């Protein structure tokens, strides 16, 4: 009946995460879900020596990984246990965009 549910989304690319969003929100207008809360970006950072050994000028690599997170928890009473699956299927599943659900 009513359960107060939450949807988590995670990703490393900004395009799919901004495309999954439009589909899901367009699909949920009826059930009463509302937009996301764009969360602070998590910045993974690694600095490594550009060489396998100590030689020449000391040059550094600067790798990073951005992780983006959008959280819809606005289903709740508007969606029952069974009806949640209605919303997680019509969307365009993408090969890499883990989406977790938890009341």
């Amino acid at each position: 009946m009513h359960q107060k549910y939450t949807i988590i989304v995670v990703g490393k690319d900004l395009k799919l995460v901004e495309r999954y969003v439009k589909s899901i929100v367009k699909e949920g207008r009826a059930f009463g879900i509302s937009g996301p809360c764009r969360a602070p970006v998590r910045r993974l950072t690694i600095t490594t020596r550009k060489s396998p050994c100590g030689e020449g000028t000391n040059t550094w690599h600067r790798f990073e990984l951005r992780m983006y997170k959008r959280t819809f928890w606005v289903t709740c009473g508007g969606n029952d246990i069974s009806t949640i699956l209605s919303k997680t299927v019509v969307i365009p599943g993408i090969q890499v965009t883990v989406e977790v659900e938890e009341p």
Partner: peptide, 13 residues
Amino acid sequence: EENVYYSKYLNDC
């Protein structure tokens, strides 16, 4: 807590 999700997306990569 969110570190759980983040570490759960690093493992699969």
